[PDB]
Write a protein that binds this ligand. Structure first.
Ligand SMILES: O=c1c(-c2ccc(O)cc2)coc2cc(O)cc(O)c12
Ligand SMILES: O=c1c(-c2ccc(O)cc2)coc2cc(O)cc(O)c12
Ligand SMILES: CC(C)=CCSP(=O)(O)OP(=O)(O)O
Ligand SMILES: CC(C)=CCSP(=O)(O)OP(=O)(O)O
Ligand SMILES: CC(C)=CCSP(=O)(O)OP(=O)(O)O
Ligand SMILES: CC(C)=CCSP(=O)(O)OP(=O)(O)O
Lengths: 400, 397, 397, 400
């Protein structure tokens, strides 16, 4: 074999069998994705070599028949802590990895919520890459992380696939790796009996960048005003709820702060509410995006996601990105739906390639028979940037 | 003896680790013996030191092997001190170190930003009561990105290329970690006043927002400190140079603000000790007499103001006197005197022979590096205590 | 207690290591206590077990986690046994294991060819008197390449996918390693007779070429064995199934040739014990009485013929009786009787209560897996001894 | 930078600073060598990725001003345990790595002769590559390796750069890695007070393959007859001497057994003696090779090497390969000499490229000013194969 994923297997081997299995169920797909997004051969090697060295050991054991890990991830259908996404727009497609870095004691008494692995991987990325910044990670780990006794209590109140506090994504963009993290607010909520809204914004308002950026303060103030009468005021875990805080692991003054809502109910009137922030936003751009999202929902179990991204130095809220949950829906149907949507958008080249490229991404499964390979679809509209489509795959479900 | 047994049972992953052991483990075991730790605790702490501390210490600086990272914790550049905390009843052993990352002091890690947290992570899975939330809070507020670390290394001596240090109290039968964060790099690189960036980091703590007594304590301390430390960006000691916390539940953790200064005379002892005349009670004045006597009987001076959630009132600080450059035999004789003055006759009688036995490779009458620091304190609750910091490597080479 | 102290001081790198400790360390500490090892040696051996053995043991097989490699050393597939060597004066503790490589039992390492030597390498830098030359000699003569290992796995049960095993004697205050190499895989894959490949490997040893007495001993043994083991390639027990050496200076090392057989009756005990009537002295006959009595009082049977450089004459072998399937309480009562017969009254009186205390989680009256083997020997020099092999995991779950 | 050596630095980083330094002083050169030998981009990645993972940690500390390792190698001028060679013939050029795998206690009381590192690396290569075989390694480690007390004595009788028992080469051929090892006989000789000839052949005659291969026995018998009256009969370490035994780490029945002589004296009458084995070989091929070697020596401190390679199933001895030592001779001169020799051989393409490619291999040093970059030149003639030129470089001396 002389494709990059094969050459790297040959050159590098595996320290253990779980890493081997992770490679044999993910790396071909990942190489295919990078080829399909028009990454040069040299970036295909860069990213696959990076994946081998940094990501495979972070993925822990490979859950399979007869071997049941101590730690079960909610990132995927089979309990594997891995997802692969593509972000599609007019001009280009970029690849992103999503995971949870599993510590060697994760899911046991010494580490019940897998509290250490993601920071360890980030520290290793910090000596690898000059632009990686840990300050926001550490701030939120301080504010929503829990001690061992509190993690043990959280595990009594959570199903096994939700024994987590954090997760990591890595954008493979511009020849670089750009890490981002998401912290769950649910375990602190449950353990402290504090409303999720309160502990989320209490955490955000202690950021150093919040204390010296009036615009971010103003934008956050606008978001709280929208969310306060929509999310619970009490301590309950009920929808819509503020379930994740996201940061970029870069200079705090440039990092996007994200507040992620989780909810089960969605219709056209809820879309509009979320997208326009209950009529706060009315410009042409906003309204053009709304139409797009509506059209997507017509064309097409996990909660929906609504993610409000805010950047220091911007006072006004933008529309959120909306996450459609696709678990349990047929992957052939979804592919047909995505083609239709791409036609609607005028992205005729994406439309013509989507199906073929999908089958080629997952050559060991019949896509037309699966319902768990497409797991999420995010849709976004931007200023100074256009419309975007994020497609999240359960790469392992696409391989076994 | 336990240090020898563990060496036989465990060996060493590499030669630097072996040299570290050979230059410190015998001394540690002696200290632990002298302090009346049981044999099972001597094993406990020495096994712990082997597995967790040895790899954290980096290379062992020695003739012909100049490491990339040089520590200001000792005279030879070694990132280790062993200290004792003495009161009348008992003596407690403590380790002070800098956990050295494998790229420390090179362009990928100019200020050794990662090794202490790595060590602390291993402790959090070892020990049930270790809590990293205050670490992570202050690492967020005074940590720097790579480019900023690189700038700071151009404006600071080799021995000050650090942001954090770790201490481990070998108390009761537990390991109790604490950490200090240095404010200087961030202040240098941001050209922010140390006073402002210190108190900003603290005012953003979760516990500060939760606890009215802590807030009251800190406003008295800012009042006291504001006029005495610089208002602009410079490094003009006296200055707020470190922030210390305990790696415990944030609500129990002491918060420590350390001033560094190069001037101490009777006027300034009085001023630091009493918070400018704020504290006038007999307990305070008894501690002041102590400190005055100590200074009569005998690196910047240190003043450490410590506060706890729950308590609105400030207490006298701990004062640190550097001992570098002063004969170690004179120091011992002076401490015997001072111990006699306190009425700690048993500590007076054993101090000098037990010291010689800690450092059998050296002549304490001819050395000037072995006692590096002395800290002195008085609390209403616990009473008087004295902290003696040894350059264990200098006491073994 | 030392096993608890070391757990507190060291923790665990991973959960499998923790489960190994939790299922074996308490028992080990008990054995070491019962054998009158000092506390400092209990620490020595337990610290060693933590650092060197735990990572060598691989995953801990348990419900829902089926490892890729399954060991024939115990009933649950765990690659560990603890054994005692009892004589009248004293009792010695020994560990038996298979060091599991991280790809063991998969296509990149089908017969676990590498983990034991890796462990042995770590011991050679730990311990001054460890010598790997006989290891390397027999690993050269009976080891296999990847493709051959893969063929052997198609012709052998899961529990026999191994070429080597390691034992560690906790003797005096030292760790003394020995290893056994299995001849079956090479014989299966090469379709060579076990007898020929066994004696070929041995005749190529450096020490064999150097030492005329060893050569004399071995020709008597080949004479004895040639007619009793197969001449063609088959696996027809009785067969020369293992070669054992000590990891010491080749000139001191015992060379052991182990027969495995499924038939033992009074005729065959006599034949194996006396080397077909070759050994007729009173010492031999006294040992035979012992073995006959043992077998009256109470997996293949084992016969281990041991030879030393320097000695021309063969000695009676050690005979191994498997105990799998027999009540552990009956076994204890039978051993008490047999100990009384030997006049080891002190061992008779304490054997059963000390056993229950080794394995407090089990009822020995209801178990059949805990005693796995019994070995018995008699030497002119050292006298009678008995080796009892426990499935420590089975005694703890 | 988008060359493979740069991309891999970017993707992989370094676990420690010595590995970083090894990379910054070797990897560019190694990439250049692979490019120059017409290795595809995919093999350039395969080998550089292999080098990063397996070789960099094996190389120990990077000896440099202010940092003096405990273990000093004789493989190179600066004490670095690394060499890079090219084997040149009519049709092709292949790259080879030579090293000593340094253990973490090498050169101290627990490991005075660096006795463990090379086997550890080989075991890791054995799970990486299906064709790697450890049986011959283990045989010779058994026969010429020493216990710790014996290694400590050896170190009292050897200069610091000769505190070794073994070294490893890795041929980067046909898209694979083919390991070979060389065991020194000197430490066992010194410690046991045994003649080097005796302990060399005693070791060889105990090989399992020797016991079942009459041809190898016959060929060895012919070599002993040649060497017996030429090398010492006593225990002295004097020339010519049998100083290394070499094996290939492959199926024993296919591995070439090598006996390496070290000597300081060489002239045309000694060349002929070694090459023809004192007149044992007289065929046309032999005599044509002799002429080549003579011509090379005319065109042009370490000992010369003479390496007799024997394969199971061949009864007759072939001519040895002859190693010319080049340390201390000007590297510009050597380059001019090699061009002349290549012209003589009719290898006009090699002749025209040699100088330019050399400067391009070592872009941070002026080659015309150095005398330690070319360290050895081996010359060989074969049956079923032709003439060969092996050029060994002190890559670190070419970089600092
Ligand atoms: O996967 C989960 C689960 C979940 C629910 C049922 C399952 O069987 C497994 C996971 C719950 O909350 C989430 C919330 C999210 O934002 C994303 C998720 O993937 C999950
Ligand atoms: O490098 C050495 C040295 C040696 C001699 C003097 C030095 O300063 C360094 C190495 C001696 O024997 C060899 C013998 C060899 O076959 C190859 C070598 O590279 C060496
Ligand atoms: C954790 C989940 C399910 C979604 C967040 S992705 P995301 O952070 O990458 O959002 P972007 O597409 O980067 O804007
Ligand atoms: C010189 C340094 C790093 C710190 C002084 S704080 P300390 O912890 O050593 O003193 P206490 O333990 O709090 O008594
Ligand atoms: C069942 C196995 C692997 C070996 C029997 S040999 P042994 O070493 O355990 O017996 P001795 O120690 O030599 O008395
Ligand atoms: C160790 C030394 C100096 C030379 C031997 S190389 P070598 O084994 O690679 O010989 P080949 O060119 O492979 O035939």
């Amino acid at each position: 074999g002389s494709r990059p994923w094969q050459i790297l297997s040959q050159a590098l081997g595996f320290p253990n069998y779980d890493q081997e299995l992770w490679w044999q169920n993910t790396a071909e797909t990942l190489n295919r994705v990078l080829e399909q997004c028009d990454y040069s051969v040299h970036l295909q090697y860069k990213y696959l070599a990076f994946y081998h060295k940094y990501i495979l050991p972070s993925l822990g054991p490979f859950r399979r028949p007869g071997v049941e890990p101590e730690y079960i991830s909610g990132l995927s259908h089979g309990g594997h802590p891995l997802e692969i996404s593509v972000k599609i727009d007019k001009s280009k497609t970029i690849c992103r990895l999503g995971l949870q870095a599993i510590g060697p004691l994760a899911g046991t008494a010494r580490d019940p919520l897998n509290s250490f692995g993601d920071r360890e991987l980030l520290k290793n990325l910090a000596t690898l890459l000059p632009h990686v910044d840990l300050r926001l990670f550490d701030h939120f780990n301080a504010q929503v992380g829990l001690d061992r006794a509190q993690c043990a209590v959280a595990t009594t109140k959570l199903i096994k696939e939700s024994h987590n506090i954090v997760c990591t994504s890595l954008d493979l963009k511009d020849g670089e790796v750009i890490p981002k993290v998401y912290f769950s607010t649910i375990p602190k909520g449950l353990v402290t009996e504090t409303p999720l809204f309160d502990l989320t914004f209490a955490a955000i308002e202690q950021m150093e960048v919040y204390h010296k950026d009036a615009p971010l303060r103003t934008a956050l103030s606008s978001l709280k005003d929208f969310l306060r009468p929509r999310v619970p005021t009490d301590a309950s875990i009920t929808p819509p709820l503020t379930g994740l805080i996201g940061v970029d692991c870069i200079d705090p003054m440039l990092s996007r702060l994200k507040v992620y809502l989780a909810t089960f109910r969605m219709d056209l009137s809820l879309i509009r509410d979320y997208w326009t922030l209950g009529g706060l936003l009315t410009d042409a751009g906003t309204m053009k995006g709304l139409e797009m999202v509506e059209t997507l929902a017509k064309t097409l179990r996990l909660p929906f996601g609504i993610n409000y991204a805010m950047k220091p130095g911007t006072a006004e809220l933008a529309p959120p990105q909306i996450y459609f949950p696709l678990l349990g829906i047929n992957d052939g149907f979804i592919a047909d739906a995505l083609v239709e949507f791409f036609q609607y958008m005028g992205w005729e080249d994406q439309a013509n390639r989507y199906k073929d490229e999908l089958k080629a991404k997952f050559p060991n499964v019949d896509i037309s028979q699966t319902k768990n390979v497409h797991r999420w679809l995010g849709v976004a509209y931007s200023e100074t940037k256009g419309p975007s489509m994020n497609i999240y795959y359960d790469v392992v479900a696409g391989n076994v």
